[PDB]
């Protein structure tokens, strides 16, 4: 037996495991977990900008001005929009909203509106505008969508109703209008005096028209009538013209797009908490430097890449050998 030199490798107390193609559950001296699995369970400001919390209101309830949504009558810039799965406060007067999903999609790239009084209500001097319904009641009295005007007979007459607006606002403007489809003809005559009425809307590109439909339907919010809403984006310097002999639900306001950018509607039942994040999911906010996460596919902000994986651990060291 003589002097010796031996060649060898590191071992330690690590119990970190990795998988390979050939072998599973291999213990290694060093490893790097590249998958974020945690979140704070909260809805937060995104880079210090809070979301728009609709609460019990839908997108339609907000923009039309359902009186249960009055807290939303003027809202500042947002980073994302929180909407419940089945918001209670939408179309208080029942009906429909044409191309509603398209409108929601637009909202994904809008971060602020300026509401502009495009067709002030007091300028309809030839028609009654104090029209409302118990279905949109406020303090036990009939009322109506705050942003809209229900034109009805004045002094037993309904002259041809004309309004127009040139978009001088400096940005594209979202404008909504409706047509009332009555339950019966007593309703039609009491409200509009006229029969065989029409609602016409025209811009440089839109020529969308309507004849109201009178017809018995099951009651929704107590009413068999319906209001069918439609919308358009009015380009800068273009004009919208409304024309009607009955059944027009006119906008009083338009929503000028005042800020654009990546946003989104998050479906959540939760409420905003006093917290800050760069990456928001519907389950909660992520704060990580890791490249992947498995929290939720629908994220907003500066986020890691979502994968379905339960684990992603890269070996960096060598097989840890007893």
């Amino acid at each position: 037996p003589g002097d010796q030199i031996c060649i060898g490798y590191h071992a330690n107390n690590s119990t970190e495991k990795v998988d390979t193609i050939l072998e599973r559950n291999v213990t290694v001296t060093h490893a790097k977990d590249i998958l974020e699995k945690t979140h704070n369970g909260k809805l937060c400001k995104l880079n210090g900008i809070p979301p728009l919390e609709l609460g019990d209101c839908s997108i339609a309830g907000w923009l039309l001005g359902n009186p249960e949504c009055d807290r939303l009558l003027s809202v500042p810039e947002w980073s994302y929009i929180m909407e419940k799965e089945n918001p209670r406060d939408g179309l208080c007067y029942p009906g429909s909203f044409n191309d509603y999903e398209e409108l929601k999609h637009l909202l994904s790239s809008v971060k602020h509106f300026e509401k502009v009084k495009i067709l002030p209500k007091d300028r309809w001097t030839q028609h009654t505008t104090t029209g409302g319904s118990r279905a949109c009641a406020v303090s036990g009295n009939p009322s109506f969508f705050r942003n809209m005007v229900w034109l009805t007979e004045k002094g037993s007459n309904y002259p041809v109703a004309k309004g127009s607006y040139n978009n001088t606002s400096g940005e594209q403007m979202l404008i909504i209008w409706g047509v009332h489809h009555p339950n019966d003809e007593t309703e039609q005559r009491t409200l509009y005096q006229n029969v065989g009425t029409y609602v016409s809307v025209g811009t440089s590109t839109l020529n969308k028209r309507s004849t109201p439909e009178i017809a018995t339907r099951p009651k929704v919010n107590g009413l068999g009538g319906r209001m069918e809403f439609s919308w358009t984006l009015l380009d800068m310097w273009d004009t919208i013209n409304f024309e009607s002999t009955g059944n027009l639900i006119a906008p009083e306001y338009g929503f000028k797009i005042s800020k654009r950018g990546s946003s989104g509607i998050m479906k959540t039942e939760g409420t905003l908490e006093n917290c800050e994040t760069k990456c928001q999911t519907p389950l909660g906010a992520i704060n990580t430097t890791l490249p992947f996460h498995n929290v939720h596919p629908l994220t907003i902000g500066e986020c890691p890449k979502y994968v379905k994986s339960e684990k992603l651990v890269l070996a960096t060291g060598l097989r840890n050998v007893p």
Partner: protein, 172 residues
């Protein structure tokens, strides 16, 4: 493993060797102890650092789901959207998982190669001045003090210097 050193002819690792992935254990009259090979450790470290960065960087152009809604009369469109977003999700989950498995395999084999190459470097320097025991160790046919051990570790062993003492010892 592929290169036969780690958990191979070098049957176990060293808890005693704390400051590197690969290195040496020496034994003479002056005493004994451990020492990491800094060159080989550093080369491996650089490679591994490059590896992790590469796996991450290749999956930065990865699909994102973008929230959209559909009417009750757009069920085909909704299904198409769902199949697409799920489809890319499954592709990228596959890419991430596979990449990590394949590269983990190669990472373990890389360290195995590194150990074997270090062994062979020492072997090829010591030549027949030592006995190759078969366990990662070389037993010297001469006395090899700390200075001698240090020369082996930094690849400056003097074969001719000990040749005569070794041949005499080896040949009896």
């Amino acid at each position: 493993g592929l290169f036969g050193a780690i958990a191979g002819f070098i049957e176990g690792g060293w808890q005693g060797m704390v400051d590197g992935w690969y290195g040496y254990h020496h034994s003479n009259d002056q005493g004994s102890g451990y020492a990491a090979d800094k060159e080989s450790t550093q080369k491996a470290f650089d490679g591994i650092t490059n590896k992790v960065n590469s796996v991450i960087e290749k999956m930065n152009t990865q699909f994102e789901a973008v929230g959209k809604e559909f009417s009750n009369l757009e069920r085909r469109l909704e299904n198409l959207n769902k199949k697409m977003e799920d489809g890319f999700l499954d592709v990228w989950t596959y890419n991430a998982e596979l990449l990590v498995l394949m590269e983990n395999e190669r990472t373990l084999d890389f360290h195995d190669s590194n150990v074997k190459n270090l062994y062979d470097k020492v072997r090829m320097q010591l030549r027949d001045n030592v006995k190759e025991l078969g366990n990662g160790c070389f037993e010297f046919y001469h006395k090899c003090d700390d200075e001698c051990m240090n020369s082996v570790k930094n690849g400056t062993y003097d074969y001719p210097k000990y040749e005569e003492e070794s041949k005499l010892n080896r040949n009896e």
